[PDB]
Write a protein that binds this ligand. Structure first.
Ligand SMILES: Cc1cccc(-c2cccc(C(=O)O)c2)c1
Length: 242
C-alpha cells in the first residue's frame, strides 16, 4: 500500500533543501513517498488551511458565493496584491490572509472546532487566536493527512453541502491544459520552526486522479517557487504528466 523511494530525495538535495513528496494513485489505492517518517510528521498548515476555511465559510453562509466581494480594509500591507478587493477565487489565488482572518472571526471558535472535527482535519486543534491559529496556534497536519482530507473533498464526502465542495474545488483551480488539470493550494509557514513551504492538491487525468502533498524546508522566501517545481518534476519522472 505504501512504497518508499529514497531516490526521489535527489529532487530536494540538488536544491540544497530537504522535504517530502507524497503521491496517491486513486485507481490503484497505492501511495508513494521519498520519506515515510516526514510524510507523517505534523506541521502548521498555514495557507493550505484556506481550503477547509473556505468550505466552512461557504457552508455556514459567511461567504454567499464565489462572486461576493470582500472589500479591502484600507490598511496598506507589504504584499501589494492584498491591497485590493477580492472574491473567493482571487483570495485563494493570492493567499490573502486578511480576508481569511475575517472569515475565521465570523465562523467563531465553537463552529470552527466542530467543523474541523467533522472533517477529521489534522490534529483538529484550534488552540491559539481564532484569527491566526493556522499560522501560529496549535493546529498541525501531515502530508498523508492532507491526502486523506483532499480525497474526501474530491469525492464530495466531507460533511458540508455538495455546493460548498464544488465551489472550493473551483477556487483551487491552478493549471489546466489538454493533458491534465491541477487543483491545489500553496502554503508558507514562517512563525513556528521549522519554516516550510507546502503544495497540496491533485492532478486530474482522463482516467485517473493522482493526489499529492509536499512540504519542504523554506529558510527564506527565495525558494518558494521550488514547491511547485519539484512537485512537477516528480510527476514528470513518474510519467503522471508529460
Ligand atoms: C515573502 C512572503 C511573505 C509572506 C507571504 C508571502 C506570500 C503571499 C501571497 C502568496 C504567496 C505564495 O507563495 O503564493 C506568498 C510571501
Amino acid at each position: 500500500e505504501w512504497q518508499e523511494n529514497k531516490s526521489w530525495n535527489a529532487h530536494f538535495t540538488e536544491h540544497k533543501s530537504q522535504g517530502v513528496v507524497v503521491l496517491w494513485n486513486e485507481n490503484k489505492q497505492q501511495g508513494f513517498t521519498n520519506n515515510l517518517k516526514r510524510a507523517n510528521q505534523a506541521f502548521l498548515p498555514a495557507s493550505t488551511f484556506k481550503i477547509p476555511n473556505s468550505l466552512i465559510a461557504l457552508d455556514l453562509g459567511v461567504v454567499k458565493d464565489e462572486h461576493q466581494v470582500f472589500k479591502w480594509d484600507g490598511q496598506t500591507r507589504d504584499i501589494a496584491t492584498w491591497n485590493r478587493d477580492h472574491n473567493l477565487i482571487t483570495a485563494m489565488k493570492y493567499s490573502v490572509v486578511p480576508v481569511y482572518q475575517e472569515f475565521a472571526r465570523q465562523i467563531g471558535e465553537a463552529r470552527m472546532s466542530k467543523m474541523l472535527h467533522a472533517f477529521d482535519y489534522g490534529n483538529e486543534d484550534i488552540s491559539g487566536n481564532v484569527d491566526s491559529f493556522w499560522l501560529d496556534g496549535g493546529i498541525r497536519i501531515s502530508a498523508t493527512e492532507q491526502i486523506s482530507f483532499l480525497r474526501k473533498l474530491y469525492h464530495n464526502k466531507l460533511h458540508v453541502s455538495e455546493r460548498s465542495q464544488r465551489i472550493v474545488k473551483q477556487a483551487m483551480l491552478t493549471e489546466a491544459n489538454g493533458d491534465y488539470i491541477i487543483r491545489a493550494k500553496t502554503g508558507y509557514s514562517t512563525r513556528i520552526e521549522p519554516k516550510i513551504g507546502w503544495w497540496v492538491g491533485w492532478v486530474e487525468l482522463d482516467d485517473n486522479v493522482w493526489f499529492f502533498a509536499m512540504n519542504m524546508d523554506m529558510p527564506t522566501s527565495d525558494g518558494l517557487g521550488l514547491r511547485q517545481a519539484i512537485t512537477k518534476e516528480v510527476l514528470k519522472q513518474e510519467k503522471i504528466i508529460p
